[PDB]
Amino acid sequence: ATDFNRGIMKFDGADSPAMIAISAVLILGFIAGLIWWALHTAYA
Amino acid sequence: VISVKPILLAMTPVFILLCLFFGTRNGFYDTDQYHGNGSAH
Amino acid sequence: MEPLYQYAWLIPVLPLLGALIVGFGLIAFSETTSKLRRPSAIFIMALMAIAMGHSLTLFWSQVQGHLPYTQMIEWAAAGNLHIAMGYVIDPLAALMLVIVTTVAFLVMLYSDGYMAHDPGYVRFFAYLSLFGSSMLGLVVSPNLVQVYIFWELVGMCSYLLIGFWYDRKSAAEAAQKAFVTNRVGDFGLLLGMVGLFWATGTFDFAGMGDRLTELVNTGLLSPSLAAILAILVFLGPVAKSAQFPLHVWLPDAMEGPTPISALIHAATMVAAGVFLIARMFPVFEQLPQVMTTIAWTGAFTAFMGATIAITQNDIKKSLAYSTISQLGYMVMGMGVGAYSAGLFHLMTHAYFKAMLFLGSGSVIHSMEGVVGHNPDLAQDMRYMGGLRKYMPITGATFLVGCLAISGVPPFAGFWSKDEILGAVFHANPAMWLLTWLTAGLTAFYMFRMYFMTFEGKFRNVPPERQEHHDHHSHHAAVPHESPWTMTLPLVVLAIPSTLIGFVGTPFNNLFEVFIHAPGDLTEFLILGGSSVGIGLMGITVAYLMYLKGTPSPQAIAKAIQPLYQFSLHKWYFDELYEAVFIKGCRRLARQVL
Amino acid sequence: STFPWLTTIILFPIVAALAIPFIPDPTGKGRPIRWYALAVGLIDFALIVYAFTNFYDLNTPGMQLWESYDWIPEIGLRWSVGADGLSMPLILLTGFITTLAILAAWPVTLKPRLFYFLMLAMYGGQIAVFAVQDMLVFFLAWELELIPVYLLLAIWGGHKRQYAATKFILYTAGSSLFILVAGLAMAFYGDTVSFDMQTLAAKDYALGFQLLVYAGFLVAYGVKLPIVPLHTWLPDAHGEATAPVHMLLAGILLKMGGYALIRMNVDMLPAAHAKFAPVLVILGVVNIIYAALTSYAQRNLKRKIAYSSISHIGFVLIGIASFTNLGMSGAVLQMVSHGLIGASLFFLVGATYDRTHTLILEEMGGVGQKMKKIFAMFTACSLASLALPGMSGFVAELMVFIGFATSDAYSLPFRVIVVFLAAVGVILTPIYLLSMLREIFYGPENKELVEHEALVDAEPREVFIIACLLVPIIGIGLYPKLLTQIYDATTGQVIARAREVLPT
Numbered sequence A: 001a002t003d004f005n006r007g008i009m010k011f012d013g014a015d016s017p018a019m020i021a022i023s024a025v026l027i028l029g030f031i032a033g034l035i036w037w038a039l040h041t042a043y044a
Numbered sequence B: 001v002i003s004v005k006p007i008l009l010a011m012t013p014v015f016i017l018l019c020l021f022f023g024t025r026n027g028f029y030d031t032d033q034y035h036g037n038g039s040a041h
Numbered sequence C: 001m002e003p004l005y006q007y008a009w010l011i012p013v014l015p016l017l018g019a020l021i022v023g024f025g026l027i028a029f030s031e032t033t034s035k036l037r038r039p040s041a042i043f044i045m046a047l048m049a050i051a052m053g054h055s056l057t058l059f060w061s062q063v064q065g066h067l068p069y070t071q072m073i074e075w076a077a078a079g080n081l082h083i084a085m086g087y088v089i090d091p092l093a094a095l096m097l098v099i100v101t102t103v104a105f106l107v108m109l110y111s112d113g114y115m116a117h118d119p120g121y122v123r124f125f126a127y128l129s130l131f132g133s134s135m136l137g138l139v140v141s142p143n144l145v146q147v148y149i150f151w152e153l154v155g156m157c158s159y160l161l162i163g164f165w166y167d168r169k170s171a172a173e174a175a176q177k178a179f180v181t182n183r184v185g186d187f188g189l190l191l192g193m194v195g196l197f198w199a200t201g202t203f204d205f206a207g208m209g210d211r212l213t214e215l216v217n218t219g220l221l222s223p224s225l226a227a228i229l230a231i232l233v234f235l236g237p238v239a240k241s242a243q244f245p246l247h248v249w250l251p252d253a254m255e256g257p258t259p260i261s262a263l264i265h266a267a268t269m270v271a272a273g274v275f276l277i278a279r280m281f282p283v284f285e286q287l288p289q290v291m292t293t294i295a296w297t298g299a300f301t302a303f304m305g306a307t308i309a310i311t312q313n314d315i316k317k318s319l320a321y322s323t324i325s326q327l328g329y330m331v332m333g334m335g336v337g338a339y340s341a342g343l344f345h346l347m348t349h350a351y352f353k354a355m356l357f358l359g360s361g362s363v364i365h366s367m368e369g370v371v372g373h374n375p376d377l378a379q380d381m382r383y384m385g386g387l388r389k390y391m392p393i394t395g396a397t398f399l400v401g402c403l404a405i406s407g408v409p410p411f412a413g414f415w416s417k418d419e420i421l422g423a424v425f426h427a428n429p430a431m432w433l434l435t436w437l438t439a440g441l442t443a444f445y446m447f448r449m450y451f452m453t454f455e456g457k458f459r460n461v462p463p464e465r466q467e468h469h470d471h472h473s474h475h476a477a478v479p480h481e482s483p484w485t486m487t488l489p490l491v492v493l494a495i496p497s498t499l500i501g502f503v504g505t506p507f508n509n510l511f512e513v514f515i516h517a518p519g520d521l522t523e524f525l526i527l528g529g530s531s532v533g534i535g536l537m538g539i540t541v542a543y544l545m546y547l548k549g550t551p552s553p554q555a556i557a558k559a560i561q562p563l564y565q566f567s568l569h570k571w572y573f574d575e576l577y578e579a580v581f582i583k584g585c586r587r588l589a590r591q592v593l
Numbered sequence D: 001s002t003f004p005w006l007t008t009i010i011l012f013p014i015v016a017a018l019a020i021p022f023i024p025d026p027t028g029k030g031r032p033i034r035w036y037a038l039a040v041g042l043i044d045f046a047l048i049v050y051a052f053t054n055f056y057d058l059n060t061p062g063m064q065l066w067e068s069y070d071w072i073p074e075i076g077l078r079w080s081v082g083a084d085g086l087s088m089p090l091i092l093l094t095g096f097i098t099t100l101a102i103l104a105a106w107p108v109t110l111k112p113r114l115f116y117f118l119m120l121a122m123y124g125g126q127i128a129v130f131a132v133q134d135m136l137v138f139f140l141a142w143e144l145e146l147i148p149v150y151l152l153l154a155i156w157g158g159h160k161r162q163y164a165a166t167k168f169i170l171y172t173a174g175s176s177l178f179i180l181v182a183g184l185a186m187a188f189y190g191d192t193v194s195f196d197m198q199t200l201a202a203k204d205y206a207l208g209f210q211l212l213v214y215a216g217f218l219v220a221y222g223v224k225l226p227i228v229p230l231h232t233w234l235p236d237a238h239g240e241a242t243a244p245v246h247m248l249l250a251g252i253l254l255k256m257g258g259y260a261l262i263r264m265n266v267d268m269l270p271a272a273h274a275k276f277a278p279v280l281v282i283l284g285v286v287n288i289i290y291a292a293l294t295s296y297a298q299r300n301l302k303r304k305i306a307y308s309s310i311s312h313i314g315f316v317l318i319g320i321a322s323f324t325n326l327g328m329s330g331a332v333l334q335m336v337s338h339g340l341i342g343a344s345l346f347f348l349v350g351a352t353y354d355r356t357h358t359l360i361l362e363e364m365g366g367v368g369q370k371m372k373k374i375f376a377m378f379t380a381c382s383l384a385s386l387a388l389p390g391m392s393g394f395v396a397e398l399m400v401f402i403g404f405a406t407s408d409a410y411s412l413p414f415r416v417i418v419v420f421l422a423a424v425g426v427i428l429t430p431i432y433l434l435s436m437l438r439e440i441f442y443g444p445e446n447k448e449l450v451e452h453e454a455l456v457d458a459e460p461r462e463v464f465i466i467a468c469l470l471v472p473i474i475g476i477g478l479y480p481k482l483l484t485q486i487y488d489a490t491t492g493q494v495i496a497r498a499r500e501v502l503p504t
Ligand SMILES: CCCCCCCCCCCCCCCC(=O)OC[C@H](CO[C@@H]1O[C@H](CS(=O)(=O)O)[C@@H](O)[C@H](O)[C@H]1O)OC(=O)CCCCCCCCCCCCCCC
Pocket: C173, C176, C177, C180, C184, C245, C246, C577, C578, C579, C581, C582, C585, D431, D435, D438
């Protein structure tokens, strides 16, 4: 929160929930889709 | 093929002998050189 | 003879043994061995002289006429997959081995007197010996896995050689950028090795060649997958050496000591990316589309470097971009089918480029003796003037190098350049005319450098900057001269530039029958005459533009504003290359965290 | 051959730890305590080496030292010890790492008695885990290491360590929750109620029951070994610690969860292992990708190296499910190389923490102008950590890539996708380790960092520990045939059984 943006990683949207929520659901969606695709693709 | 036992039995006694000889060597934790008990805290 | 070939494996080991001996004692005491500067370098010089004598003996035995030797053994074996490593003895291997050993010996002879004012002297010689040992290991390597091993070793030791003073902030980011630039090509070579071991699995080069030939003949795979694998193989020397996508690491790696760049630019990191494609020639001769795109990206980066290196105020950056332009020539020639001519052009280019970098370092050391520790006021060309009367033989050696890089009379690079242009003219006329304009464009800024560095009136420093020469070096008012140390390799490296021009003629063509691919024409004379004509054009343009001064470049800069400002910085390359990539990686890592 | 060796090697630190509260009067800081503990660790490592070099053979693929002792006529607690092929270098790594961690713990003043007592208590359990060949005594040895490391991280650590220590002990309790259930489930199927290890591998189960047993195994082994849904405990565990406990934290304690992950989930049941092999490979790929992208944006000095443990154990998670002899043989070498790299790196981080009190990468700008041995050792350990071929990390990832390249039942898409993703993973993994060395040392001299704190150049004692830790990695990376012949027959039998069970 306060000790995360002190060097060259300073941006405007870091603790806003509306950005990290869609980023987290996109990451989890690609993780679940990759797991499902590797499960339905292999051994075939 | 190279074995592990004759190259380990010839390297472990000098490893045992050097531990105490480097344990008596110090100089950084001697006079004061530090303000602390040793851990992070 | 046969014990001399059986015992031909400790030659890259003895500089590594000397580096181990130096590094085991440099960290154990660091105050006792720090006083010993001269004999610790004399021992490394004697080891390099023994290695050079062994290299000359092996090259004499190879040119006398024998068989290519091999020695392989099992390395990390398994139940079914067996990996073989060792060393191969080839006439091309000894031909590169004598070049690497002679260049390293002359760089050490230069650094004996170049580092006479730096407290760090023993780690410099230890790192140079480690670089020489890693290059000697990279030369003799029949397996591609140890090619990758010595590739990683060259990348690591170059990362160590860039950061030496650890005081400046540019060399901090330069090594970190060069390591990831080498990591991109390492990724490409790793994907190529994975695909090659997926298709093949015979570890020899000719075995991989005829196994891929039999796999193409009997239909099992698609040629598009082999084309993608060949592009992934070529992606290694794209990012390790200089090409169109990845070439911005070389002006960053230019910053540092001059014997560092004298080994990096000559035959160690420049020649390795060409030697990787040289060992993969029966793999690449099967399909021609990868050869066409290799020649096209080589001609493109050769055209790009010539337009970059015109409006450059630094001497070493312009020399590095001319090295990029010659890399474009040899990569395009290797893509066309000028393989032996490309290897001879690489040998000639290294032969005059090591001498040219040593002369540039001598000029830089003289200006360091004149102008103080500010590097931006030392490597600039606005202060260079009237250096011919103070450096007669150094100026003559630089004139010999700057004339042999053009070669409008028959010289060393003359026959190789006309053979390259004849191969491209047999391939494609558009790339031939592009390289014909590029050969005059490089001679333009070459003679611009020659007429702005030495010849002219003596120009001093304006009073807005500091004027003192007693910061951390010797006290001298006039531009002095190196007595005996730096003057020796500049006259040693003169006679090969005379010898290889007459020894590599197309009439006898001993290099074609000496180095062959594993399997009198008047048009050649008129392409050579066109090359001499455009070289004379470049000489007559760059002569009176800077000596007489009637076509002043200030009116030319006021004439064309956007074409000058687009190529002024570099070419507007890095401000697009690093910015959005670093910001996207930072935003992605921030979102992940 | 008729003498018990591993039992006395396990029981000797537990007996010798009773002399730590005795301690005739030193009148000082506690130097006879560490001088006795170092000698105890030295003679224990000497006994380990003398027991390894004489009785351990390289011909029998089973167990050379087989010693069984009837503890009780009850449930089936039986002191049956046995050394295998892929477990014999683990004990020699355990003793070496614990001996150098004992030797590295010189500046201990606040309570050294309980420190060295818990050290000698954990050294017994770290051999009792790898030396046992039971189902219930293995869970007992797994829960034996619950209290001492948690107590050490409680009594000293960084800031807000009380929030991390309770989370660590509750995570270890949640890990140990499923082990007893998954051990009793395979033992209570049918008959032969006794808990012998050789009889549990010959039993036959149903398909859904084996799937449930493999799920109960994989939940505990994903809690223990850090994967991307269950790695939130590891920054709080491995960032808030001191060096001599962090050596054992980042060394053999992470390989303990990977050794059992092979030995149970391949030998006990390989039928359900193939159905979760692409899931485990994809999870290791996502681990390798996520660790570097998390550690690059981090500003803490110790979590930046703690996520490298995840980035290096993702290679083991890839190489476990490769179904190849070379891919199985490279995992033990990768574990040994990762332990020998991470112990040296975290000892070096804990050593340089005492010279500069602030753990921020921004203020550390001019620490390299005075001390040069520290910068040289950091550069050498980092270059050993990234991709170098003289060290055995490149040889281990090359073995993983070669064993995964020639596989079966993943023909067209899976091998090229996993290889292309691990390639960008090894693109991403040196970035933060390069940026840390670029930001800390390479730069101008900070005046306030010298005015506030004064740093002293390193001892020749600190050179000796890194010189002892760096030479086996170079010795393995230069000649990888030394570790191959130790477990070649065991890995061949394991891959032969796994290919006999797997059809087509
Ligand atoms: C016609 C099409 C042509 C396409 C061409 C494609 C080219 C691809 C290769 C591009 C290589 C660029 C190298 C840049 C290196 C650099 O900026 O400095 C080095 C930086 C340092 O950054 C930071 O740099 C800071 C210093 S400074 O900013 O550099 O000054 C430093 O302080 C900090 O620690 C550090 O984090 O390193 C980075 O972290 C990023 C390195 C580049 C990342 C490589 C992955 C990119 C993959 C491309 C995917 C392509 C997608 C399409 C696929 C077909």
